[PDB]
Amino acid sequence: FCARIFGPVKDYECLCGKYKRLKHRGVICEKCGVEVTQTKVRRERMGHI
RNA sequence: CCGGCCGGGAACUCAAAGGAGACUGCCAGUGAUAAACUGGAGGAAGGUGGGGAUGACGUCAAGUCAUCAUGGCCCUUACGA
Numbered sequence: 001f002c003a004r005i006f007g008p009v010k011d012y013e014c015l016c017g018k019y020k021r022l023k024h025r026g027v028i029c030e031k032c033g034v035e036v037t038q039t040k041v042r043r044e045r046m047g048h049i
Numbered sequence: 050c051c052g053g054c055c056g057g058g059a060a061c062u063c064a065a066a067g068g069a070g071a072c073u074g075c076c077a078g079u080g081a082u083a084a085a086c087u088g089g090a091g092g093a094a095g096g097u098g099g100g101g102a103u104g105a106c107g108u109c110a111a112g113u114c115a116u117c118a119u120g121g122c123c124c125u126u127a128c129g130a
Contacts, residue, residue, distance in 0.1 A: 004082090031081050 004032035006045040012036045 003015035012022040014034045019027070024036045 029081095033082065 003029070003034040005047055007042050008034065008036050008039045011038045011040070013039065 003009060009015060012024050013020060014024075014029045014036060016029055016031065016034075018029050019034070019036055026035060026037075028035045
């Protein structure tokens with residue numbers, strides 16, 4: 001359950017909360033890559049190991 | 050009569066040089082995907098592998114007029130020889 005590994009906890013919502021803007025799209029949390037997109041797409045977030 | 054004493058040989062020890070090479074090249078952990086540090090294999094040498102030389106503008110009106118030279122000062126029957 002990560003935003004850097006997968007995605008926004010909420011629609012255009014950063015892990016830390018640096019982006020509580022549902023206008024912010026693409027720009028990541030510079031600490032850890034959180035590309036803001038709709039959290040609903042996390043029903044299709046494919047990762048690996 | 051083996052202190053290689055007499056032949057013989059050109060790969061090596063050694064030496065004068067043209068160059069390869071070690072640069073964080075690879076894997077992993079830690080870590081803000083950067084950098085970096087540690088361990089190991091690899092490797093002749095490992096994390097600038099070691100040392101010398103190289104001493105940034107400047108500090109100290111510190112040394113030399115006793116290598117020497119010098120704007121001047123003194124001596125020139127002299128301290129010059």
